[PDB]
Amino acid sequence: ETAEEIQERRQEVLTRYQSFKERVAERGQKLEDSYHLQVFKRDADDLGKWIMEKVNILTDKSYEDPTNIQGKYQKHQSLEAEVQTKSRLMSELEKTREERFTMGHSAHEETKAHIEELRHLWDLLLELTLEKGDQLLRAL
């Protein structure tokens, strides 16, 4: 009730509300950023696990019993398919990294690192499936 035309300085004391709205928008945004990052990380890690499971099956030369080669070749062909279809997930992650975590993003280097770790694991799988494969081809 001071300088009643001047009172409206209390209205500018309302600006808090503007600073309040902005901070709400920021928290939400940051939470969204964290969501996409965590979701990515988990998908990447899971892809890592998946690859290692395959790699372990391929290198378990320390063996089961089996000796039918034509059939062994089928189990192997079926494995190459699994890899092919799953390869699509690799692409999607690369695409996601390129597009959703670009220059000007906190997780640019972190999300680039994961995709690099998988590229390396991917190579390993490819070498091992190609090698197991090749033995079978030679054994008929």
């Binding site: 209205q11 309302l14 939400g28 979701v39």
Partner: protein, 182 residues
């Protein structure tokens, strides 16, 4: 009947003139100014109620006055003036009542608006703890929980949009400035 009538006319005027001065003083007496909530609303209107009660008296006084003047009573001049006087103090009374009544509505705004502000200001202080956190999750599950908590939080925030929106529109106090400003 002439002397009785005349005498009676002046008796009524005097009585109404005394009563008006009392009521006019009744208006100004209360100060300019309620703290927060104004019983002055009830108090000021009560005065109007008393004014209505006199309505007949005026008519009576006024009529007698007029009839007396029509019938060429030879106190006519003294009569004319006293009935102007009563009529003058009548318009003046209702002008000074209504004059104030507009203001009772005017002060009503600040008391309400001011309170409205402190309540809002207080509520924003209250949300700080939540809104201060630096937890954003370290896991899909954790972040999903925080987003949903935020979703709840924003909705309740949304409610106040109206409450704040009201404080946007200006006041009659500030509106009247146009007449003072221009």
């Amino acid at each position: 009947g002439s002397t009785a009538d005349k005498f009676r006319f002046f008796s009524m005027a005097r009585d109404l003139l005394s009563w008006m001065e009392s009521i006019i003083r009744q208006i100004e007496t209360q100060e300019r100014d309620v703290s927060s909530v104004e019983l002055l609303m009830k108090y000021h209107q009560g005065i109007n109620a008393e004014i209505e009660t006199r309505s007949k008296n005026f008519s009576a006084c006024l009529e007698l006055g007029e009839s007396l003047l029509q019938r060429q009573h030879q106190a006519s001049e003294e009569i004319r003036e006293k009935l102007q006087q009563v009529m003058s103090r009548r318009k003046e009374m209702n002008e000074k009542w209504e004059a104030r009544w507009e203001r009772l509505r005017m002060l009503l705004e600040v008391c309400q608006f001011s309170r409205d502000a402190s309540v809002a200001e207080a509520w924003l202080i209250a949300q700080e703890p939540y809104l201060a956190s630096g937890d954003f999750g370290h896991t899909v599950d954790s972040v999903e929980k925080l987003i949903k908590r935020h979703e709840a939080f924003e909705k309740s925030t949304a409610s106040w949009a109206e409450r704040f929106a009201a404080l946007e529109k200006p006041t009659t106090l500030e509106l009247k400035e146009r007449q003072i400003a221009e």
